[PDB]
Amino acid sequence: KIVNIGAVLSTRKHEQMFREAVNQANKRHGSWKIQLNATSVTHKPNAIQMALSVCEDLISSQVYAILVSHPPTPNDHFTPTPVSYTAGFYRIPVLGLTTRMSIYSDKSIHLSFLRTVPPYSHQSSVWFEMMRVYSWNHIILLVSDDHEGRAAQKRLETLLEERESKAEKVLQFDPGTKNVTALLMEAKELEARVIILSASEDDAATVYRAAAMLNMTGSGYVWLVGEREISGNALRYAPDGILGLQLINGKNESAHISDAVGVVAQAVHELLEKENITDPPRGCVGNTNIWKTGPLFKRVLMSSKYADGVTGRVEFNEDGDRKFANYSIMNLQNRKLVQVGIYNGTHVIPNDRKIIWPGGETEKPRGYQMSTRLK
Amino acid sequence: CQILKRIGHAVRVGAVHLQPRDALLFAVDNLNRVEGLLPYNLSLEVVMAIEAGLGDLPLLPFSSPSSPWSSDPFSFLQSVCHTVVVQGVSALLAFPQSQGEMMELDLVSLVLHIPVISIVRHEFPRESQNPLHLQLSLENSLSSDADVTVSILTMNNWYNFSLLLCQEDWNITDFLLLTQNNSKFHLGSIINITANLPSTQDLLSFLQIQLESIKNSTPTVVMFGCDMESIRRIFEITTQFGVMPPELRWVLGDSQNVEELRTEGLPLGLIAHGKTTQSVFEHYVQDAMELVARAVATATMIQPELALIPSTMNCMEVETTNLTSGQYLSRFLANTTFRGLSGSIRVKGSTIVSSENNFFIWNLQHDPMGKPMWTRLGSWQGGKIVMDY
Amino acid sequence: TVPQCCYGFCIDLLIKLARTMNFTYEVHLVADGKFGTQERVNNSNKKEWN
Secondary structure, three states, X not given: OEEEEEEEOOHHHHHHHHHHHHXXXXXXXOOOXXXXXXXXXXXXXXXXXXXXXXXXXXXXXXEEEEEEOOOOOOOOOOOHHHHHHHOHHHXXXXXXXXXXXXXXXXXXXXXXXXXXXXOOOHHHHHHHHHHHHOOOOOOEEEEEOOHHHHHHHHXXXXXXXXXXXXXXXXXXXXXXXXOOOOHHHHHOOOOOOEEEEOOOHHHHHHHXXXXXXXXXXXXXXXXXXXXXXXXXXXXXOOOOOOEOOEEOOOOOHHHHHHHHHXXXXXXXXXXXXXXXXXXXXXXXXXXXXXXXXXXXXXXXXXXXXXXXXXXXXXXXXXXXXXXXOOEEEEEEEOOEEEEEEEEOOOOEEOOOOXXXXXXXXXXXXXXXXXXXXXX | OHHHHHHOOEEEEEEEOOOOHHHHHHHHHHHHHOOOOOOOXXXXXXXXXXXXXXXXOOOOOOOOOOOXXXXXXXXXXXXXXXXXXXXXXXXEEEOOOOHHHHHHHHHHHHHHOOOEEEEEEEOOOOOOOOOOEEEEEEEOOOHXXXXXXXXXXXXXXXXXXXXXXXXXXXXXXXXXXXXXXXXXXXXXXXXXXXXXXXXXXXXXXXXXXXXXXXXXXXXXXXXXXXXXXXXXXXXXXXXHOOOOOOOOEOEEEEEOOOOOOOOOOOOOOOEEEEEOOOOOHHHHHHHHHHHHHHHHHHHHHHOXXXXXXXXXXXXXXXXXXXXXHHHHHHHHHHOOEEEEOOEEEEEEOOOEEEEEOOEEEEXXXXXXOOOEEEEEEEEEEOOEEEOOO | OOOOOOOXXXXXXXXXXXXXXXOEXXXXXXXXXXOOOEOOOOOOOOOOEO
16 A cells, blocks of 8 residues: 655756655644555646656656646746646646645536645635735725736625625725826825735836825825735835735745645544555556546545644645634834734734834824815 | 737637648627727638648649658647748637647647647546636536536426436436435435336336336426436326326426427427527637637737737747747636536636537427417526526 | 706795805706606616606
């Protein structure tokens, strides 16, 4: 009953870390019917050449599950797409260690996938929670023409449907636009001041620059942003005191690797305890049908509930994402991010650190500036 | 101005037949005749990526035995990319029929970094979900026809009905699953009208017994896997003992063409379902061409240089651009939904070009002269049944 | 469409509301002028005010 662990990670250092974690998990496993084998595969520098090498190596070894890592590109849906594609039709679940994106959650594309990182759009709901306490009766939503952005907008609207709020207006930004101030023409139209938006750093840079043009950089306006625009090319045009976002274990690949190793160690013992144990198929051409152990194996895997790994609080559910996530908020002043807020997913722990509203305003104003004339 | 002049003021599409020319010409003519599909006075052009080399089109047809396909898909991919670059094809049309040919076409598309749309008669299980590859299932899942059958019960709350399967191998699993999805539906006693009976009297007795059992339980019936002649024989058997509508309400749970839905032998009040149009290959080709042209025109309305001019300027050079032209064409195709003659072509999962064929539901009612005829009770499309009358 | 002289009883009431509550204003008459009524829609069920 040799269980092989095949994975794809960038650089040989991550492969060495994975091998060390596999060895440590084997040393920490009391099961006498489990043999730990780890196979390391590097990233092929070609989308065409990646699929053939992946099929010729991981599939032939009859390994269990596929672990994803940070793509070599700064932000691209290329590295894990072939993994979720070639093995997706073979009834082989895959866990994304660095999967903070919500794109692969439609359950029709890459159905067999578990998200080891929270979706970026999920924290949008925290915005409602962020709006739950600090007044903010009404805000204006701005979203780019993105599938993830559309899903986040829908989720936020559903959350607002609980409190019966119309969210003032929602603008649908167009990705790749070079003239965004025109869309922000209605920015001064409404009487509110709380702006909820977050997008790519390249997209956010032009808007952040153009806000000062429309005098939106002045005090009395409120802008809330996500971590995607927290740092990057937009950091030049970011407003002072702007409430950004950050996430715990944002670059701790070792913590995610250790947590995944522990979860897999538990899942192997859980699965190797009942009948109908469909062994992994061997080869990439011989296998022309999925394995017998399909949804039952996924359900069995989706049963680990403990505090394992550096991250801890493994509560994967729903489409395959954990629960009780921790978010960070760093105050922007003098082009430097200074942490001022921490959330455990249930209640955000504030800090005594100064929280200046946009324009360097220590006071927090309200989002309703009554009009001086009507029609 | 400059972009159209560089691209010839036209949208070029490559067509490769893995294993049809007249159909492609008809699709191109239909796309050209649909003015306004592509703005900026852009017309649709089709370039054939045949296995032959460079040369002007000859008006001399010669039939020769083609050599066996090369074991290396890399050469085929390079030749396809070179032909597309010579013809400036923004999108690729394919007709894959086997797993290896589909893999080779997908590899060619990935190397060229451009979308490739392939029409497959059978919707094979697809592992790769690359936007560079899109598949159009010519024969979609029959469950849609099953979705039609329960749709009939949705019109007048026919939640109680009997099942008559004239085929022992008929697959009524999809319709049963659709009906069981709603708790209101109450399927009646299972009636299996087998044709293995060797005598007319025994078959008549069995049919009469089945009708007697069904009448006191459900007020309507649904027939699946029954031919027109079988339906006529069943109706004659029912009318022999006087079992007729509307006390015994008949409905056809199978797709039956209007031409084969002869008024003779059909008791009045019977409900039938059929295809709006005979789904020939030409209709599918025209719909795919229209969807691709709409995708190209929509992508050109914002990025004409990207949509018209392909990203791959060299077959051996894979451009690491931020946004590839073929990627834009693939996104437009994945977001493209159109209403072709054969039905509605929608892109689901960025990979499946599903053609939900429009259907017609009719009831057995008298025509203006009083003779029986198939009067369409409504048209069903996208799961919605709208009554014509 | 031309600028017009408007005044009235209710215009005086409007002036009073302006004075007490500190808001400016710009006024214009209506399109077809029938105090508003509940009218059935051209292409929906009933929901239209004219």
